[PDB]
Amino acid sequence: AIRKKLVIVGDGACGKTCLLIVFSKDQFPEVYVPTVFENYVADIEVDGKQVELALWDTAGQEDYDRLRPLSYPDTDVILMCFSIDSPDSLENIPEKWTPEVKHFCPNVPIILVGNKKDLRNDEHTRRELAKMKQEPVKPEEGRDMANRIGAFGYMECSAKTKDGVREVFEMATRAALQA
């Protein structure tokens, strides 16, 4: 087993904490969804290789520019998160998150992850977004953004329905393994 380190970055409403919890529990919490995530060491086996993946969150650190970079040392893979029901969180990816991740984590692979994909076909979501001259982030828009920022790849998931969650973490393990 090789030890690798994954850090999840992105805006407050991107749903990065829910993604970590649903993955670490391997279930959608049926009684209480916790407010915070501490850390977790996942035993993952991808493409025949056994890896110990330490999972870290940056939630609560978005306003503290000197505290936040202390999460970056020895990172092997970055999960750059944005919410599909929030086009403004995607707009902040190349001008706020990408320059910071490339300064503190040079040559580290970044996977651009579109969270809350179930909300792409939500009645309340499409209506609420239309009241601001907006619509849910389309799959081609996420792919375009990942190209623009030089991401290793672009993926989508839904922590609520657990769809796409396992695949994001297996891919992240594969990205951490490359040299």
Partner: protein
């Protein structure tokens, strides 16, 4: 950690920790408030358990089993004694508040109605000054990590000691570097927990105001810690 507190906080939520016939007696909004309060104490117990691994298992183990140069162990675990005193006292007050709230004849059924006052005390006055000063001193976080990395890759006895004390499954996510980041990230969890407790504390207006003040206090502390940080290099 002591078995007493580990059992009282073994459940995933307050609604699962209390007896179901006690849960049935409360309104939904109370259950939601209590679940976040339980998470605050539960994660505070884990944070204090982390600082105990750093002082008793890592730091003291290196002083008694290794011949490290003077100042090496201090550089690996800066302010851990001060941090352990600050948070063990805060945990003691949270656990005492829970205990006074227990129903007679019960060791699990309780409701914490007044938390904001305890949070205002913690994040104000001398106790706030000592947390700001101790967390600003984060500036030594990177140097501690480099020192650990240098020793693991150059010292046989240090590597054997590390491999030995971190071998139990209970320390899987609690190694030297994991401990250091878990401590740095703790302070930025407080606003998240307090805002969700406040979200469900509008029932009593004094409690909503106490929590609003307590939230403002944590954010002032975090802003002060953030401004006082500058990475040190060896």
């Amino acid at each position: 950690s002591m078995e007493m507190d580990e059992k009282d906080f073994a459940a995933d939520s307050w609604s699962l920790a209390v007896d179901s016939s006690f849960l049935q007696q409360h309104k939904k909004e109370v259950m939601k408030q209590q679940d976040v309060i339980y998470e605050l104490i539960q994660t505070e117990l884990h944070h204090v358990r982390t600082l105990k691994i750093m002082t008793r298992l890592f730091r003291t183990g290196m002083l008694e089993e290794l011949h490290l140069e003077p100042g090496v162990v201090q550089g690996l675990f800066p302010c851990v004694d001060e941090l352990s005193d600050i948070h063990t006292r805060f945990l003691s007050q949270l656990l005492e508040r829970r205990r006074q709230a227990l129903c007679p004849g019960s060791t699990r059924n309780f409701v914490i109605h007044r938390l904001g006052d305890l949070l205002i005390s913690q994040f104000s006055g001398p106790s706030a000054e000592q947390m700001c000063k101790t967390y600003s001193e984060c500036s030594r976080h990177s140097k501690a990590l480099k020192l650990y990395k240098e020793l693991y890759a150059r010292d046989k006895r240090f590597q054997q000691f590390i491999r030995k004390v971190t071998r139990p499954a209970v320390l899987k996510r609690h190694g030297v570097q994991e401990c250091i980041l878990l401590v740095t990230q703790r302070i930025t969890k407080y606003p998240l927990l307090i805002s969700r407790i406040l979200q469900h504390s509008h029932g009593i207006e004094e409690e909503r105001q106490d929590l609003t003040t307590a939230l403002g206090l944590v954010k002032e502390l975090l802003s002060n810690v953030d401004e006082g940080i500058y990475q040190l290099e060896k």
